């Protein structure tokens, strides 16, 4: 999502997203070259309100699309001094709408740009245990094959952690969970036969990035059978808390009692008061084997082009008929920026010269076909009017 | 270096004696717990030189 | 048995002081009570205190 705010009101009559799709065309730098065509159509929430100073654009990419990558001169066929991905927008000057947006933005100064990116259904994540690296494509044991008090499970995804993330979360499924985890441990009692596991609160965790969930309970009821887990995190101003390691970490408050199985099994088996039955023997302690981990996140940047002491981390480039110009670099401030080059009424002829030197004379012959002009024009250079000449220096035109 | 062990070498001996007692009925409170192994993390170092 | 900490950057300098800190993970609520079943002689605990 892109938002553009200007000093003046753009139009009395606001515009539909189908109007904008006739005026502009948008492309991205991807893995195999430029991403273009149908995948880059503006969506229905885009548009312009008449009296507003704000234009909104909205684009989405399917999970089947190529990745968006940093610009490469050898792949995207250009010459820009850019080390980031590019988003390019051109006006459809062939059409009345395209030509008219160009004119409307020539004088209306741009002041603010906001960029919001939302991503979901991420599966290429890195998983770790206290024992090492896990393979997310196979059922794995978060917290180990034999969990203990204090063991942990860590989820990492660098692509999100390097951005000004405001929110991030994930989901998991469990595999061979018993029909009732509390009844499963009914044979494990202390004192006057009081159960160690009295209810589901027994199984809880600590979230080091400070989870937003309503309780610390490890398992949440699945709308179907069995259990899943759900961990939601929020970052109030998009600023990662100092001292945390840019990873999502969960730790166990209490063990699953693997260390007690032998003790309870023995005591039942050697009782002289009762005859052991299958219902009196302890069940093997559960190890929480899991699968299908899915990640999602949101990140936001907002740039005031006129404000000092602000991380204005964006680069702006203008596209011109025969070239381009860098306008705004990261860290800069300005008071007057426009989205487009300013071309005034009239005509221009450009002459490029080869192999000269900065103090030499040049003599040029202009051979015309004399008489080949339109005789029926009333504006004909009366008085002392004439054709003007200029030269180029550091991308500026200068008078001789 | 450690002055005294954490008694890993005695667990089997005490467990057995409780289990085969003819004087008392074993209960969970009478059986030995597994000896502790001091697992640790977050080591942080600092220094001064002149 | 032993545990050794090394850091060459400090050890090559005229160090006047050096120190470190560690955390433990799954330590029992009370290390002395943990070994109450391990006794000798007339039921006297091997671990009497910290």
Dihedral over Cα of A243, A248, A252, A253: its sign: positive
- Tokens representing residue A281 in the block: 């023997």
How far apart CA A213 and CA A258 sit, in angstroms, is 28
- Cβ-based contacts of A267 with chain B (< 8 Å): 26-28
Contact call for B2 and C7, based on CB within 8 A:
no
- Cβ-based contacts of B20 with chain A (< 8 Å): none
- Tokens representing residue B5 in the block: 């062990």
- Tokens representing residue C32 in the block: 């002395």
What one-character-per-residue DSSP string does A150-189 give?
T-EEEEE-HHHHTS-EEEEEEEEEESS--S-TTGGGTT-E
Element (H, E) at A249: strand A248-252
Dihedral over Cα of A173, A174, A180, A182: its sign: negative
Which is it for strands A220-221 and A205-207: parallel, antiparallel or unpaired? unpaired
Closest CA to A203 of A176, A221, A225: A221
Which chains sit next to B, with 3 or more Cβ pairs under 8 A? A, C
- Which chain A residues touch C if contact means CB-CB below 8 Å? 148-150
How far apart CA A60 and CA A40 sit, in angstroms, is 7
Three-state DSSP state, C10: helix
Three-state DSSP state, A374: coil
Q: How was this structure determined?
A: cryo-EM
CA A10-A3-A73 angle, to 5 degrees, is: 110
- Which chain C residues touch A if contact means CB-CB below 8 Å? 25-26
How far apart CA C15 and CA B49 sit, in angstroms, is 4
How far apart CA A90 and CA A46 sit, in angstroms, is 17
What one-character-per-residue DSSP string does A309-371 give?
SS-----EEEEETTEEEEEE-TT---S-B-SS----SS--------S--TT----------TT
CA A213, distance to chain mean position in Å, is: 24
In residues, how long is chain B? 50
Closest CA to A140 of A296, A250, A287: A287
How far apart CA B32 and CA A345 sit, in angstroms, is 96
Three-state DSSP state, A105: coil
CA dist C34 → A93, A99, A189, A239, B36 (Å): 82, 83, 18, 44, 9
CA dist A271 → A186, A266, A282, C43 (Å): 17, 9, 14, 25
Closest CA to A310 of A301, A318, A319: A301
Closest CA to A93 of A24, A158, A167: A24
Dihedral over Cα of A145, A148, A151, A153: its sign: positive
Closest CA to A88 of A341, A316, A304, A333: A316
Interface test with A, best of C25, C28, C29, C34 (most A CBs within 10 A): C25
User: Hey, which residues does A113 pair with through a beta bridge?
Assistant: A4, A303
Please give the backbone phi and psi of residue A267, each rounded to the nearest 5 degrees, phi first. Answer: -60, -40
Q: Distance (Å) from the C-alpha of residue A198 to the closest C-alpha of chain B?
A: 18
Check if the beta carbon of residue A282 is closer than 8 Å to that of residue A258: no
How far apart CA A281 and CA A285 sit, in angstroms, is 12
Q: What is the resolution of this structure in A?
A: 2.7
- Give helix then strand counts, H and E, for chain B: 1, 1
How far apart CA A251 and CA A232 sit, in angstroms, is 15
How far apart CA A105 and CA A342 sit, in angstroms, is 9
- Cβ-based contacts of A148 with chain C (< 8 Å): 26
Contact call for A270 and B26, based on CB within 8 A:
yes
């Amino acid at each position: 999502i892109l938002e553009f705010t200007f000093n003046k009101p753009i139009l009395p009559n606001g515009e539909d997203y189908t109007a904008l799709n006739k005026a502009m065309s948008i492309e991205l730098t991807g893995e195999k070259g430029w991403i273009a065509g149908l995948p880059m159509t503006l969506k229905s929430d885009s548009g312009i309100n008449s009296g507003s100073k704000k234009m909104k654009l909205s684009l989405t990419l399917d999970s089947e699309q190529p990745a968006v990558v940093p610009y490469q001169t050898e792949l995207h066929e250009g010459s820009y001094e850019v080390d980031e991905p590019l988003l390019r927008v051109l006006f459809k000057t062939n059409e009345k709408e395209g030509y008219n947006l160009y004119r409307l933005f020539n004088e209306n100064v741009l002041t603010d740009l906001k960029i919001t990116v939302e991503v979901s259904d991420i599966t290429s994540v890195q998983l770790e245990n206290d024992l090492g690296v896990l393979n997310p494509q196979k059922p794995f044991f978060p917290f180990g094959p034999r969990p203990i008090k204090g063991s942990s499970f860590i989820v990492k995804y660098p692509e999100a952690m390097e951005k000004p993330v405001t929110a991030i979360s994930y989901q998991m499924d469990y595999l061979n969970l018993p029909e009732n985890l509390v009844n499963h441990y009914s044979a494990y009692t202390i004192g006057d036969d009081e159960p160690l596991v009295s209810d589901m609160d027994y199984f809880s965790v600590k979230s080091f990035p400070k989870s937003s969930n309503d309780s610390d309970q490890l398992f949440s009821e699945k709308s179907g059978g069995g259990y899943e887990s759900d961990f939601e995190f929020q970052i109030e101003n998009g600023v990662w808390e100092s001292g945390l390691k840019k990873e999502l970490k969960i730790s166990l408050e209490r063990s699953f009692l693997h260390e007690k199985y032998a003790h309870y099994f023995t005591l039942v088996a050697i009782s002289k008061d009762t005859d052991p039955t299958i219902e009196l023997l302890p069940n093997e302690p559960y190890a929480p084997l899991a699968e299908n981990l899915v990640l999602g996140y949101t990140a936001i940047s907002s740039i005031d082009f006129s404000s000092s002491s602000s991380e204005n981390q964006v680069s702006l480039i203008h596209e011109m008929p025969f070239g381009f110009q860098q306008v705004f670099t990261p860290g800069d401030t300005d008071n007057s920026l426009y989205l487009v080059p300013d071309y005034c009424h009239g005509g221009e002829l450009y002459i490029g010269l080869e192999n000269g030197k900065n103090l030499q004379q040049v003599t040029l012959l202009l051979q015309f076909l004399e008489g080949s002009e339109n005789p029926d024009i009333t504006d004909i250079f009366t008085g002392n009017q004439k054709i003007k000449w200029q030269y180029l220096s550091q991308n500026q035109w200068q008078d001789f």
